[PDB]
Amino acid sequence: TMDEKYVNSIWDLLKNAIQEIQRKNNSGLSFEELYRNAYTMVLHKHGEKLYTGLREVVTEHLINKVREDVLNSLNNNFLQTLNQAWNDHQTAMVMIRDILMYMDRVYVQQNNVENVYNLGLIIFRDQVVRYGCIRDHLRQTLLDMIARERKGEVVDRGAIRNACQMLM
């Protein structure tokens, strides 16, 4: 078999550029190099390490950005912050998906594991809408706006609908 030392050595820069992509930055990296490097390691059954690395960087990015921004925001635009954080998460997840299809078609199927898109969605669900503090904040805030809206008071219904869409 092949020696794994330089595979892991380049995998470090690969994961660093992956995290850069997660921050919606592609102006300081070669997309072709990332695509080729990521695709290559899947053929020879290093996809377990790739799966775990993607899992951990997605989880860390989620914890350090989405939860923090959600908790820092105040209500009556808590929905706006949650929505835009979710949109940034989805954009990052889609751009990451653009990097990997082969693993998302062969490795996850042959390992019978979750797709990195679906896995990242699971992480977002666990860390935002099922996480206690954020979930209760969202629930009470939505309850408040849908109570006030029936009074004729001015609320933004698009954000409420979007939050419910995130929920289901």
């Binding site: 592609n26 070669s30 997309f31 072709e32 695509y35 080729r36 290559t40 053929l43 653009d98 299809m101 082969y102 078609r105 062969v106 199927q109």
Partner: protein
């Protein structure tokens, strides 16, 4: 890579110039990425600029023909097993079924290469022997006759007269889809075993 209506793949170092539309038949295959001229798949070569795919051109042929005109044509000078592996690489289930059908036809035709080959023994005496030898099925080949000791007289006109071992070159189906038992079938097999 370079933008064109077609795309030039470096399949095993070999330039496949094929149109992007014929590669949009199966997004569920690696090719549909290689056709993206936008930064969804970016690949170049420091000599031509061709996109790079680390898949063989050996069995890429029949699969690409199946993508182009809807039907696979496995050349009868290349391993159908290799074509099945290439179908697995692009995991086209219809293509998988077609190459497995080709391999089954091979195994039926190559039952003497060690694959499925079915055998039976008939029991008959001469009178019926001529009849069922003459009315032997198309596909079943006579392989051996033998006499069995006759308590009547010394020979012919005894019910125990001739065994007739016959054979047929039967297709071997690639595993994972065939020879899958059932519970009540096993119950009856155990009943009839004794």
């Amino acid at each position: 890579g370079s933008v064109s209506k077609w795309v030039r793949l470096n399949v095993g170092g070999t330039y496949f110039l094929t149109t992007r539309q014929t590669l949009c038949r199966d997004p569920k295959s690696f090719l549909y990425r290689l056709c993206q001229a936008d930064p969804d798949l970016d690949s170049d070569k420091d000599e031509t600029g061709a996109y790079l795919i680390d898949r063989d051109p050996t069995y890429f042929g029949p699969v690409l023909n199946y993508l182009r005109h809807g039907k696979l044509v496995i050349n009868k000078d290349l391993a159908e097993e290799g074509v099945l592996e290439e179908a697995e690489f692009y995991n086209i289930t219809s293509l998988i079924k077609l190459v497995k059908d080709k391999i089954r036809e091979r195994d039926s035709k190559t039952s003497q290469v060690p694959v499925k080959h079915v055998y039976r023994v008939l029991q008959c005496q001469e009178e019926e022997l001529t009849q069922m030898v003459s009315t032997m099925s198309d596909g079943w080949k006579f392989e051996q006759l033998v006499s069995i000791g006759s308590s009547y007289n010394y020979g012919n006109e005894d019910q125990a007269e001739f065994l007739c071992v016959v054979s047929k070159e039967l297709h071997n189906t690639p595993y994972g889809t065939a020879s899958e038992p059932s519970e009540k079938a096993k119950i009856l097999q155990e009943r009839g075993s004794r």
